[PDB]
Design a protein around this ligand. Structure first.
Ligand SMILES: O=P([O-])(O)O[C@H]1O[C@H](COP(=O)(O)O)[C@@H](O)[C@H](O)[C@H]1O
Ligand SMILES: [Mn+2]
Ligand SMILES: [Mn+2]
Ligand SMILES: [Mn+2]
Length: 391
């Protein structure tokens, strides 16, 4: 094998400019990194610059270098949707025709009607809201009526909140499983159903750790499945295990923040493994992209960049570092949804003694999966073209 360990980092939502098919999505003009760089009066990302980020595209404060540390290009998404699951499933070798839906105006009446019909309970709320906002507003009504608070976020989720002393936990879980079945329907395909039990009294409600998620498995066996089946390590960091519903995962490391994510990445560099360490840095998307906060996004990008030299120092000759994203989420764009953008690709190993070069544009995110598969000698995915030989 060319590399003993591959470290794959998804900077969630860190797009590098509108894709050729952005118009279809109402995403003309989108540019996640570029608009952030303009907001910041120049982004300070010297380490990503050293890798070749500016060689992909020059942006304010992000210039090309003559000798990038590794190879660089961008990737184009082939799957229909621009959600996190689609992006990640494509990265790991799939093609996803059916997009996961978001619900800025709540769920269709047809779906909620069937959920009421199957559960024998009324549904209230039906809007995007934070857990805290929706409980403050509707918690008391929920307690008094035995209704279900159904809500969403800016992502593809359906959340059901019920008080633990009013709706027994096992009943809430049964209801969520019903909702999970009803939402395997392309009219209202949600990525994730989430049980949101809460306790307390009016003016003092708190969600409990009895939260449970109901995810969909990837629509196909992924490169991760193939690595696991061939007795390789597949270490998932952060949201990765959840995104793939555990498929192909041999170890999962929970993270609480981007900095904690980098700490866990460092933890994996310190581990003797053979296979894949796969990190998702979610703060970019969750805290900054969706909240349309270019300042916070810029600061987070600078915080992430400052962590990289330690990663560079720990990489061995037979390690490969891959840095990419799963879509865009331009924090100066209308609405609250993701944006259809190219994503950067940087590929670096210390064994690249004369630095890197430009790779041909990756025509599907599955080029990553194909590269990982070829490296480890496992079954090649149906989609994707490996760039292993180019490195
Ligand atoms: O909590 P996570 O990280 O699993 O994230 C989950 O809940 C969040 C809501 O958080 P809240 O209602 O507390 O503001 C959603 O944005 C996210 O799509 C969902 O997967
Ligand atoms: Mn848009
Ligand atoms: Mn994402
Ligand atoms: Mn998102």
């Amino acid at each position: 094998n060319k590399y003993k360990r591959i470290f794959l980092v998804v900077m969630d939502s860190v797009g590098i400019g509108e894709a050729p098919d952005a118009e279809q999505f109402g995403d003309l003009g989108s540019d996640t990194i570029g608009h952030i760089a303009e907001h910041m009066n120049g982004l300070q990302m010297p380490n990503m610059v050293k890798l070749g980020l500016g060689n992909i595209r020059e942006m304010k404060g992000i210039s090309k270098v003559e000798k990038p540390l590794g190879y660089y290009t961008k990737m184009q998404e082939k799957s229909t949707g621009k959600d996190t699951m689609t992006g990640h499933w494509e990265i790991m070798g799939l093609y996803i025709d059916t997009p996961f839906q978001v619900f800025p105006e709540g769920f269709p009446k047809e779906l909620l009607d069937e959920l009421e019909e199957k559960t024998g309970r009324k549904i209230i709320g039906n809007k995007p809201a934070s857990g805290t906002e929706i409980l403050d507003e509707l918690g008391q009504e929920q307690m008094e009526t035995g209704s279900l608070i159904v809500y969403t976020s800016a992502d593809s989720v359906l959340q059901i909140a019920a008080h633990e002393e009013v709706v027994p936990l096992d009943e809430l879980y049964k209801i969520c499983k019903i909702a999970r079945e009803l939402t395997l329907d392309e009219k209202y395909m949600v990525g994730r159903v989430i049980a949101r039990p809460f306790v307390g009294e009016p003016g003092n409600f708190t969600r409990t750790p009895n939260r449970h998620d109901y995810a969909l498995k990837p629509f196909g066996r992924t490169v991760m499945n193939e690595l696991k089946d061939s007795d390789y390590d597949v270490i998932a960091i952060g949201k990765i295990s959840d995104i793939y519903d555990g498929e192909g995962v041999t170890e999962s490391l929970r993270t609480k923040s981007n900095m904690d994510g980098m700490d866990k990445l460092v933890d994996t560099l310190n581990m003797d493994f053979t296979g894949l360490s796969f990190l998702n840095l979610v703060d970019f998307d969750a805290l900054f992209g969706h909240r349309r906060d270019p300042q916070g996004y810029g600061e987070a990008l600078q915080e992430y960049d400052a962590r990289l030299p330690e990663v560079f120092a720990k990489l061995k000759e037979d390690d490969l570092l891959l840095i990419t994203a799963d879509h865009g989420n331009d924090p100066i764009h209308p609405g609250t949804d993701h944006t259809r953008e190219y994503v950067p690709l940087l590929a670096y190993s210390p064994s690249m003694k004369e630095g890197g070069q430009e790779l041909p544009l990756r025509q599907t995110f599955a080029d990553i999966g194909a590269t990982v598969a070829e490296n480890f000698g496992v079954k090649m995915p149906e989609y994707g073209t490996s760039f292993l030989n180019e490195l």
